Design a protein around this nucleic acid. Structure first.
Ligand SMILES: [K+]
Ligand SMILES: [K+]
Ligand SMILES: [K+]
Ligand SMILES: [K+]
Ligand SMILES: [Mg+2]
Ligand SMILES: [Mg+2]
Ligand SMILES: [Mg+2]
Ligand SMILES: [Mg+2]
Ligand SMILES: [Mg+2]
Ligand SMILES: [Mg+2]
Ligand SMILES: [Mg+2]
Ligand SMILES: [Mg+2]
Ligand SMILES: [Mg+2]
Ligand SMILES: [Mg+2]
Ligand SMILES: [Mg+2]
Ligand SMILES: [Mg+2]
Ligand SMILES: [Mg+2]
Ligand SMILES: [Mg+2]
Ligand SMILES: [Mg+2]
Ligand SMILES: [Mg+2]
Ligand SMILES: [Mg+2]
Ligand SMILES: [Mg+2]
Ligand SMILES: [Mg+2]
Ligand SMILES: [Mg+2]
Ligand SMILES: [Mg+2]
Ligand SMILES: [Mg+2]
Ligand SMILES: [Mg+2]
Ligand SMILES: [Mg+2]
Ligand SMILES: [Mg+2]
Ligand SMILES: [Mg+2]
Ligand SMILES: [Mg+2]
Ligand SMILES: [Mg+2]
Ligand SMILES: [Mg+2]
Ligand SMILES: [Mg+2]
Lengths: 178, 186, 158
RNA sequence: GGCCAGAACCAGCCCUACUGCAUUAUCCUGUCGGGGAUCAAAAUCCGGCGGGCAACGAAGUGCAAGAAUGGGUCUUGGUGAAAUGAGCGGAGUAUUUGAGCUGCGCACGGCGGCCGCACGCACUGGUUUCUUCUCCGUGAUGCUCCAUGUUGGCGA
RNA sequence: UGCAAGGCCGGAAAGAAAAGAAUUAGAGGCACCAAGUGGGCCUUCUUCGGUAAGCGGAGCAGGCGAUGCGGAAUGAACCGCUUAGGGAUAUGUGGCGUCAAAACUUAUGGGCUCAUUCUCGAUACGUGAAAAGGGUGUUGGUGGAUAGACAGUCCGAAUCCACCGGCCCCGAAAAUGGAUGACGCUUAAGCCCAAUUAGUGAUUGCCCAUUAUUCCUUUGGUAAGGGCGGAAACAAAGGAGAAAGUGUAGCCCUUCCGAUGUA
RNA sequence: CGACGUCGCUUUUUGAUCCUUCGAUGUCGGCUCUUCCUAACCUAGCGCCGCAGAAGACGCUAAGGGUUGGAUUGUUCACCCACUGACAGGGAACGUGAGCUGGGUUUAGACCGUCGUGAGACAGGUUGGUUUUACCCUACUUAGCUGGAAAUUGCGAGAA
């Protein structure tokens, strides 16, 4: 399925004033479900790093950075999350995916499952596509084998939604209730 | 998870290994053995031309992988027991009361264990042959012979646990029946 | 408060600021208060005569009466469902000219000056433009906004 | 027939089908170098340089105004007892919307008067190459309410 | 002639500019006569006494009391929504394995978890049950290291140490038989994230309200309007009505808005 | 076995509160009878010990079974005597009064001490002092009659 997060580039600045006639323009990249959340994360970052509130700032552009062509790649996601018990925990994780947005969405699902971290407690520091020989975890490197083969065992294959049946003959495809 | 975990086993020339639906049958010069491994969910493969046995787990975490070497060990035990057999030799150790052991066919009677009047009786299954060494060679030695390691070791264990000391210090009162040597028939 | 005397609960209210003690200055004496003027009722702690009640501290009202040493001020006080016009009697030391109509008076004077200039044909001052409008932005320096490992390493004390 | 059903059409309303405008560059694509792995390779990856539209239903990105000139109404009234209709009449083959292309000045961008103008404003500019329905039309001399179809079934 | 105060006569009036430069289901004031009530309780947040309490006592504000309806299985107070009599269409809270309407057990979504006699978990409020401490169960992370290394008796590839998470487990004992509501569920029907028919070609899966929108009818307005000088004509073998009106079977018609409620 | 600390748990104590009951829920103890709990005294299996044996200490699974006779005291408690394998601890409206009993508490009589001028008071001592009703409904125990698978009907048709 397509990723639930998009790659946004928010460009903004503090509103020009007499005291600061030409404010610095900042480029910020974020992964958010929509552009309103992207602007929210941008203004949070501006507040916590530059002391610039949204009430005194401009957003020059909020565009989606398009994905590249889908290619099986190794993505390095440097990511951090907050918990009351531990504070800020930074980790660097490698993922197999076809896009940066897919890799980051997978990272968010992974943090939500293995550490119970939610979107607004998570900061993606960086996402980079790395070569095969820079992959350190065997759980990812096993997909670099040239003769990578495996069967599909324990498949749970459901019929086409129209063809699905409640009662079917035991050694037969004849549907009795459908 | 790991995509492919693999264990390989070599087969001696005489042995014949066949797998069918996680059931392994091993045939050697001294009989045949069977193992029901349908509780494992592994990919068992036998290469007859290259005389190799292979067990594969696909997409496994730590718990399923731990079953690979267990399967290899079971099949290796079957091969060894079907080509050499298993011989467990137990000894009767006593301080004062001589433990008297009678082996009439498949029945083992233990008498006078710590001077008790109760008779401990064991019915060895037909796949395990129990004999008693001549006391001139080794005194108080009972031998279990079989092709199945698990059956022979279970018989030796149940004989060991029929003669546990109750309601006494166990550091003292070292009387009991203990397996001493675990070797092969051939 | 445990008792309900006239000056109950005024320990910090009727105290002088740090290093600002002393009696009212000559500028307070020389201030001319007229009937109809807007005044602020601010009690001077060092006078203690003609002192307003604590309620009227920080209230702005209109002068209704001038005596040789006192000022009569009308203060709005909400009591239940209505507002009462309370007339309080304080000494002039506890009264300040209120700038509450300064901006409105300046607006009136600016309007009169604008009318005078429009009559005289003088060019009016240019109208200020809205800062909310769009336009081209030419960034002299563009920086990357991001979260670094050093931010986390810094926010941890000891 | 003041009863029960079916279908047809009219007005209203409620659902659905039919889609354009902007954007893309951290992108697409060749080649040289590096690097990677191989059995040799290609690839994953990093730079330089040269071209660009990833346009198949391109994108799951921002905004969409596309005249049902297909369903439902036993969720409303009706069968023309005033039909107001882009829909019903009458008359014309045109009107002018937009899209292309394009003139002058200004505006905007770059360099600081030129060079650009993605096609912004004024001339309600030009061209019709594609696209399009364009004008008229009926008071109540009705103050109010109620009274008008078709096909069967059941009622003689 | 200055100041202060009452006036009188004139002037000028963005009727208040431009700079983000207010908004209003905004008739403002003034009375008269009276009723119930004057035991209150709960909750977010703030708060005092108390070991605490479903304890006692306060502040701001919402509730219940006085109030149902739709949800949390059940509950005055929690969530949603607040109510004329009825349809249709959409939702809210909450759900879509059966009970029970909705995924006839959805996806062409990712991870995690095995829990043996109060039987793992699915309990917002609800603490309406659990901690300190611990686990070589498993799955993640952060540092450090050692690499013919560790173990084994040399011999061929990764190994070791400390620390911190997720879920699970131990810690974890009460009296009638019993409670995620029940059954069950483990390619979950559990937990944490995501989605709406799925890298296909765009942004509404589905079910349920006394809520929203809309239609019909009733009733009352701080109600808003029109008509009311019978237009003309018209036997039986198109009809009837038309009142200058608070209130009736309301003169008649059109049009808006509101309808719950203890004392 | 655990000092200094620290975290729990349980309602077999007592407090704290005042929600319910004041046109009344009979309000000590015992007797009898049943059942439940487990934090296990004995009885079944075990682990461990400063475990030689014997006797024991600690701990686990386990509440199926058992857990007494007496002197004093109204007592609950207490204590002692004696058996025993053991004489574990608790709940059930502090189980149980239309089941009993009525020794105690707690009316009216009376005595004493202390207190009070006194009438009288004392959670101080003492003695004497009405224990009502079931035939209703359920529950339980037995004892009878009797239809019924569309659980009375449909004709609605399923054979372990
Ligand atoms: K290359
Ligand atoms: K009472
Ligand atoms: K027992
Ligand atoms: K009693
Ligand atoms: Mg002993
Ligand atoms: Mg203070
Ligand atoms: Mg102060
Ligand atoms: Mg026409
Ligand atoms: Mg303005
Ligand atoms: Mg009262
Ligand atoms: Mg209370
Ligand atoms: Mg009341
Ligand atoms: Mg509920
Ligand atoms: Mg309510
Ligand atoms: Mg259903
Ligand atoms: Mg619940
Ligand atoms: Mg909780
Ligand atoms: Mg813990
Ligand atoms: Mg349950
Ligand atoms: Mg439930
Ligand atoms: Mg009674
Ligand atoms: Mg009673
Ligand atoms: Mg126990
Ligand atoms: Mg014991
Ligand atoms: Mg025992
Ligand atoms: Mg006795
Ligand atoms: Mg009790
Ligand atoms: Mg009792
Ligand atoms: Mg009784
Ligand atoms: Mg009685
Ligand atoms: Mg008595
Ligand atoms: Mg006396
Ligand atoms: Mg007595
Ligand atoms: Mg007496």
């Amino acid at each position: 399925v397509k990723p639930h997060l998009r790659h946004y580039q928010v460009v903004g600045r503090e509103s020009p004033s007499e005291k600061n006639p030409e404010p610095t323009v900042y480029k910020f990249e974020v992964f958010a479900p929509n552009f309103v959340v992207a602007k929210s994360r941008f203004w949070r970052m501006m507040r916590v790093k530059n002391k610039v509130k949204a009430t005194h700032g401009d957003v020059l552009s909020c565009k989606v950075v398009k994905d590249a062509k889908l290619v099986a790649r190794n993505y390095l996601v440097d990511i951090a999350y907050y918990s009351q018990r531990c504070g800020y925990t930074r980790m660097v994780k490698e993922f197999r995916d076809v896009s940066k947005t897919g890799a980051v969405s997978q990272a968010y699902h992974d943090l939500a499952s293995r550490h119970r971290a939610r979107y607004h407690n998570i900061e993606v520091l960086n996402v980079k596509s790395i070569p095969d020989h820079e992959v350190k975890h065997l759980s990812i490197a096993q997909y670099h084998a040239p003769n990578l083969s495996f069967p599909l065992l324990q498949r749970r294959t459901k019929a086409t939604r129209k063809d699905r049946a409640i009662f079917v003959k035991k050694n037969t495809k004849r549907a009795v209730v459908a | 998870v790991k995509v492919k975990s693999l264990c390989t086993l070599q087969i001696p020339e005489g042995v014949t290994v066949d797998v069918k639906g996680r059931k392994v049958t091993v045939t050697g010069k001294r009989g045949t053995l069977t193992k029901d491994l349908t509780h494992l969910q592994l990919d068992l493969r036998v290469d007859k031309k290259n005389r190799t046995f292979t067990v594969i787990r696909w997409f496994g975490s730590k718990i399923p992988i731990a079953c690979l070497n267990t399967t290899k060990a079971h099949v290796q035990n079957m091969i060894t027991g079907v080509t050499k057999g298993y011989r467990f030799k137990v000894r009767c150790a006593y301080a004062h009361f001589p433990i008297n052991v009678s082996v009439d066919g498949q029945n083992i009677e233990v008498r006078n264990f710590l001077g008790e009047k109760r008779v401990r009786r064991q019915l060895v299954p037909n796949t395990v042959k129990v004999s008693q060494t001549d006391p001139s060679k080794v005194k108080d030695e009972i031998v279990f012979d079989g092709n199945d390691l698990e059956q022979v070791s279970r018989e030796a264990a149940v004989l060991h646990q029929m003669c546990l000391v109750k309601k006494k210090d166990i550091r003292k009162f070292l009387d009991g029946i203990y397996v001493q040597t675990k070797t092969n028939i051939e | 408060v445990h008792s309900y005397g006239y000056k109950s609960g005024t320990r910090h209210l009727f105290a002088k600021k740090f290093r600002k003690h002393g009696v009212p200055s000559v500028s307070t004496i020389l201030t001319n208060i007229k009937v109809g003027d807007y005044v602020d009722v601010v009690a001077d702690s060092a006078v203690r005569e003609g002192m307003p009640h604590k309620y009227y501290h920080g209230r702005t009202g209109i002068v209704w009466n001038v005596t040789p040493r006192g000022v009569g001020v009308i203060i709005n006080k909400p009591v239940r469902t209505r507002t009462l016009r309370k007339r309080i009697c304080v000494r002039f030391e506890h009264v300040r000219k209120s700038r509450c109509q300064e901006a409105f008076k300046a607006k009136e004077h600016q309007f009169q000056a604008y009318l005078a200039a429009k009559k005289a044909g003088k060019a009016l001052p240019p109208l200020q433009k809205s800062s909310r409008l769009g336009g081209i932005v030419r960034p002299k320096n563009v920086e990357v906004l991001a979260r670094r490992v050093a931010d986390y390493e810094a926010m941890v004390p000891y």
